Amino acid sequence: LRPSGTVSCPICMDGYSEIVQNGRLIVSTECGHVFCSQCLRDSLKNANTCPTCRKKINHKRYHPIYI
Amino acid sequence: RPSGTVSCPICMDGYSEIVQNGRLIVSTECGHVFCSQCLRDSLKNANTCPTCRKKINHKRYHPIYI
Ligand SMILES: [Zn+2]
Ligand SMILES: [Zn+2]
Ligand SMILES: [Zn+2]
Ligand SMILES: [Zn+2]
Numbered sequence: 001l002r003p004s005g006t007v008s009c010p011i012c013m014d015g016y017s018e019i020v021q022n023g024r025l026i027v028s029t030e031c032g033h034v035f036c037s038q039c040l041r042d043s044l045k046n047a048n049t050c051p052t053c054r055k056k057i058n059h060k061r062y063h064p065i066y067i
Numbered sequence: 068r069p070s071g072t073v074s075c076p077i078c079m080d081g082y083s084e085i086v087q088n089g090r091l092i093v094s095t096e097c098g099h100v101f102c103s104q105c106l107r108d109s110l111k112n113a114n115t116c117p118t119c120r121k122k123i124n125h126k127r128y129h130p131i132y133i
Contacts, residue, residue, distance in 0.1 A: 005082060007071060016071040028094055065131060 011039035011051060031055045077105035077117065097121045 002008060007016040007026060014036060019026060025037040033052040035043075043051045048058045068074060073082045073092055080102060085092060091103040099118040101109075109117045114124035 007073065020070070 007034065009034070009036035009039050011043065012036060029055070029057050031057070073100065075100070075102035075105050077109070078102060095121070095123050097123065 002013070007019075008014060009019060014022075016026065019036045026034060027037050027040050028034050029040075029050045029052075031050050031053050033050050035051065040051070044057070048056055050057050068081075074080060075085060075092075080090075082092065085102045092100060093103045093106050094100050095106070095116045095118075097116050097119050099116050101117065106117070110124070114122050116123050
């Protein structure tokens with residue numbers, strides 16, 4: 001059982017207290033998707049995208065300049 | 068309220084009260100959580116997080132060194 005309206009990680013299936021009492025953090029992507037810190041890091045080892053919605057969660061900070 | 072409560076500290080509305088009435092839970096980049104409406108309201112007159120006061124309005128311009 002995984003009630004709607006509760007904080008949990010969809011990867012490891014751990015709830016809020018299980019996550020924080022083990023020394024992990026709750027994290028969010030910028031697209032609003034919530035994970036535990038360990039699961040999202042493990043995910044980003046094999047992919048640059050959000051596990052949930054697959055939006056790119058890397059951002060390279062450079063841009064064209066027009067002289 | 069207690070650890071694991073998703074609520075806005077400004078209006079004090081709990082999770083259910085926020086999302087069911089067309090607002091959203093929002094987080095600043097500094098990890099601080101509010102309802103969409105209270106955070107937006109605060110950002111109309113200040114550029115900083117209401118909780119930790121980190122500046123959270125970026126500057127989409129910068130020097131270029133040529
Ligand atoms: Zn997890
Ligand atoms: Zn996402
Ligand atoms: Zn609020
Ligand atoms: Zn903050």
